[PDB]
Design a protein around this ligand. Structure first.
Ligand SMILES: O=C(NCc1ccc(F)cc1)c1c(O)n(O)c(=O)c2ccccc12
Ligand SMILES: O=C(NCc1ccc(F)cc1)c1c(O)n(O)c(=O)c2ccccc12
Ligand SMILES: [Mg+2]
Ligand SMILES: [Mg+2]
Ligand SMILES: [N+]
Ligand SMILES: [N+]
Ligand SMILES: [Zn+2]
Ligand SMILES: [Zn+2]
Lengths: 368, 184, 368, 184
DNA sequence: TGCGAAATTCCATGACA
DNA sequence: ATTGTCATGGAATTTCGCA
DNA sequence: TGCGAAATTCCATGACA
DNA sequence: ATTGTCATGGAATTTCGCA
């Protein structure tokens, strides 16, 4: 009610009500002539009620919202109250999308030797060839050497069958994967414990993380499409030739084929590289340890003009699963527990369990 | 003349028959003539088919300048001889009845035969599933003549599963018990 | 065959075979010791045969390809021959994606008055509300004032029904649309001829063009999702309230609501803006023509470091419809007939009819 | 006191019955008391329902400070009276039997009645489909008293379909032929 | 002729099938 | 024959209140 | 000690569900 | 608890051939 506004109308000044304005009463309301015309000045008891009223017309953001108010009312420090109400509007918070981009990406170090890390994804589904339907792609981290296995599903079942042939050659220390259905099975953990293989997983819904392979997938799909122009998509039969193809092909920027990085000698393939013909294997093999280590390795890009990185205990929100239509594209807010690195954090939601996620599926919660 | 390398030559024979495991009866054995690295493909018969079926696999990894083998049915057959000609692979043959691997290969092949029979006694029928694990072994089997396993000579690094179990492999005392009672 | 290489081995120099190299014969081949070791030098009769051989291993691009060759052979101006072969590889040309970005976008002029141009798209399908399934959104160009009509399909049939209510208020001069099934009907042309409405269409597969509305769609879907949190998606009933909502809401950057831009006075809505209370309609209406014309209007962005714009008679290719999987993501090349503007061109394909398309669905054909 | 504006007041009555067109029987008529702009909603009956059904439409475009109307069933009904109270709309009434539009409105309403009967004779039954086109006309009907149509006063611009056909509209000689033979 | 704080304007980010 | 848009919320700028 | 042309390296663009 | 990648083809740079 009345409270502060008496002393105003009385004449003797109050904080944040600038003097040279003629604060009168009229129509039983505390008007004030300002340069834009006369605006009403509602009692602090009503301002929350009003700003909400205004906002709630079209769940408009800060400016949009103040501009509606401006028409009729005036008071001190306006937007401050508007911002209070916006950071309280649950619906605005879970639907508006961001305007703040994620900090620059991390270029983790090239694994040291072959078999230190294996990446694996499933490509598919595809055009039935010989009743097969997916592919299991396995890229060695260090070398980029690559194995393909054509499968009827993207199943723990057939995921295993394959690596059992793979681990004939050698056994890897870690295996990175998408948290997809076939790699998160209980049964797979056992498969890998058995062999003493540490399972490590991309954060969820983020293939940038498994991307050594996601990128080897592009290059695979690419080369078939070339080999199956003007021919029915009978891909099953090329898988071999493709596999061979890529492992034996220069990456311009390294000047080595995945095959060479992994063996140190071309096999009896075409344009087999000669250079080291004349050193004993010993001499070759040591030079390999030499090349392998002194291999190009990219740095982190500059951050965007308006990126954010993630402080601890900050308020942030996870992107909605696969949102339905007419369903907020963001989960309710949550708090950043640990920061595993500028791009990966652990958060607790209101549910509330702990989750490990890419900053890429997070938006900082606007307004605090 | 120039030094010896992995892929320069590939030695093959077939092992079998044997007690069926998931309906395979034969193991194709490929050993790299330089590193003595071993591949084991289980097959259904010593036919030029099941040979090529397998090698098409191996060769999707690496292709050998040369394939040495005895004068078996499958390796002489003009079909195989083509598959080779195609892949640009020179075929090479051990004059009948005088079979000539090499030191390291002769050896490795021996190591293998004993190795199988060692473990496919007591599960003569569950052997298909162990081919992976066997390989891993004979490829991490430290060779007297160098300081090195296949695995290290092939890849130039240390494996993550070492068989520093310098193990007997010989038909150890008890396995002749339920061995010469299963056939004798 | 032999030809040029005799005079070489003989000793007396030839063009582009640099002298201080000891060009001998050996193994019945014209070797040459170069700094990388000795490389064979095949007869010009065989070089095309070779480069193709090399490339065709993995349909590798320029560097990737030369590097395979390098191992064995050498000759003058190498890549030149490699590039010849790449620009001839039909499959490379229709599958590799671009590395050249399109020139900066055009910001066409704000239509002058209301009803000069209407944009229209269909949103959907959606969650059945009252058996309705799509929405027809109509944005006036100049003003941004907007109409919604809930429809059971995205049909010429119901597209018309609606504009027949719309053109009650007034009739527009042009109507812009996506070349979608419902706007390209024969029956619709007739509808619009009848009323003397020029039909003009976005290039195909490019909503940037119809985007005054595509952007009004975002803002629509957004506000429902806010109003239907924790409530079943019964959207049919809000269409009215939403419509009202937006037309009466400030665009921060203009400081006017679409409603005002179109009428010059707020209706009896909340926080109705007062300012012009005191001028006759006449005085208002003229000031409107004033505002309307002096309205913010954005310029063209800077071009990307590596963009292209489209010369005439250039070789370019159209992006594949919705490509299947394992099917080239580009059509065979084609020739730029007319350039309607730096972002829209007319091309003739080998089919070969004339087509009008956004530079955005074109890639310049690599290599010439 | 301040000048007059569009939206300041909205005049309504209902017209009907009439020969059914797609099963409508009534036209709700809204005229802006300033511009004399006209909206025509065809309805099924003069009920507070079908009224509100329509106005809910119009009001999704613009909301009037005031709605003036006679004392009909539908406009008095407490239901409508709420709908108004809700929308913040002042309702306003023409003392029974002494109905008081305004110069411009009185006129425009006249213009309308003659206008309908003019064209729903000869297709008394095809009139629903012409409501669009009718509106367009009475909104581009140049008003004597200003230099302006509704359309121009409402939007401040010139329409793209002008009815500079200063046309008769009066029951022109022949339409009384098959008019007073259809009822008389 | 100049301060501190507020008000305004700027503008990169993202999403419209 | 045609063509991107524009709300949003922190930042950077400009303007206000008082001397 | 320097030219013109070739060879190499650079690096923005895009696509991997 | 974890993390982007890398072929590609014009451009920009560096190096080659000859003086
Ligand atoms: O979206 C996927 N891949 C494309 C892609 C996009 C951006 C990148 F940087 C890298 C790759 C998915 C994928 O590759 N895999 O393997 C999945 O399992 C998956 C599951 C759900 C949704 C998407 C993908
Ligand atoms: O993709 C569409 N809209 C999203 C979008 C993307 C980028 C922009 F800049 C603007 C909008 C489509 C769309 O809006 N409409 O109306 C269609 O008819 C359509 C048809 C086929 C494929 C996509 C769309
Ligand atoms: Mg996956
Ligand atoms: Mg559309
Ligand atoms: N790392
Ligand atoms: N334009
Ligand atoms: Zn809100
Ligand atoms: Zn190609």
């Amino acid at each position: 009610l009345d409270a502060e506004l008496d002393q105003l109308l009385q004449g003797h000044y109050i904080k944040g009500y600038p003097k040279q304005y003629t604060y009168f009463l009229e129509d039983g309301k505390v008007k004030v002539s300002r340069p834009e015309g006369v605006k009403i000045i509602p009692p602090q008891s009503d301002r929350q009620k009003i700003v909400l009223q205004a906002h709630n017309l079209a769940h408009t953001g800060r400016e949009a919202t103040l501009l509606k108010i401006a028409n009729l009312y005036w008071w001190p420090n306006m937007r401050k109250d508007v911002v209070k109400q916006l950071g309280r509007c649950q619906q605005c918070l879970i639907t508006n999308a961001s305007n703040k981009a994620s900090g620059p990406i991390l270029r983790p170090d090239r694994p040291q030797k072959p078999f230190d890390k294996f990446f694996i994804d499933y490509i598919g589904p595809l055009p039935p060839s010989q009743g097969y339907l997916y592919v299991l792609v396995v890229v060695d981290g260090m070398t980029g050497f690559t194995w393909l296995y054509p499968t009827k599903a993207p199943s723990t079942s057939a995921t295993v069958k394959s690596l059992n042939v793979l681990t004939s050659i050698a056994i890897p220390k870690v295996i990175h994967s998408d948290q997809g259905a076939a790699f998160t099975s209980s049964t797979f953990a056992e498969w890998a414990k058995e062999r003493g293989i540490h399972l490590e997983f991309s954060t969820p819904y983020h293939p940038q993380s498994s991307g050594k392979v996601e990128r080897k997938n592009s290059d695979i799909k690419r080369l078939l499409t070339k080999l199956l122009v003007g021919r029915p998509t009978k891909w099953y039969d090329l898988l071999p030739v493709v596999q061979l193809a890529l492992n034996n092909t220069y990456s311009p920027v390294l000047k080595y084929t995945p095959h060479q990085l992994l063996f140190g000698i071309d096999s009896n393939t075409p344009f087999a590289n000669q250079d080291t013909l004349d050193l004993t294997r010993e001499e070759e093999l040591s030079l390999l340890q030499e090349i392998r280590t002194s291999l190009y390795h990219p740095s982190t890009p500059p951050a965007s003009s308006r990126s954010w990185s993630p402080v601890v205990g900050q308020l942030v929100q996870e992107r909605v699963a696969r949102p339905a239509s007419l369903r907020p594209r963001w989960h309710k807010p949550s708090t950043v527990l640990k920061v595993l690195n500028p791009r990966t954090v652990v958060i607790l939601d209101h549910l509330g369990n702990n989750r490990t996620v890419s900053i890429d599926n997070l938006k900082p919660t606007s307004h605090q | 003349d120039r030094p010896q390398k992995p892929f320069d030559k590939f030695f093959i024979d077939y092992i079998g028959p044997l007690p069926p495991s998931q309906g395979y009866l034969y193991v194709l054995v490929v050993v790299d003539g330089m590193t003595g690295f071993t591949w084991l493909y289980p097959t259904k018969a010593p036919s030029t088919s099941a040979t090529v079926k397998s090698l098409n696999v191996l060769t999707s990894i690496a292709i050998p300048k040369v394939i040495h083998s005895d004068q078996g049915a499958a390796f002489t057959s003009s079909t195989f001889a083509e598959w080779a000609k195609e892949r640009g692979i020179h075929l090479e043959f051990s004059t009948p009845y005088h079979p000539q691997s090499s030191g390291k290969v002769e050896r490795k092949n021996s190591d293998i035969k004993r190795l199988l029979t060692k473990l496919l006694v007591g599960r003569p029928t569950k052997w298909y599933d162990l081919l992976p694990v066997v390989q891993l072994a004979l490829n991490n089997t430290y060779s007297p003549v160098l300081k090195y396993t296949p695995h290290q000579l092939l890849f130039g690094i240390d494996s993550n599963t070492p068989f520093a179990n310098q193990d007997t492999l010989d038909l150890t005392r008890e396995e002749e018990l339920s061995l010469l009672q299963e056939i004798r």
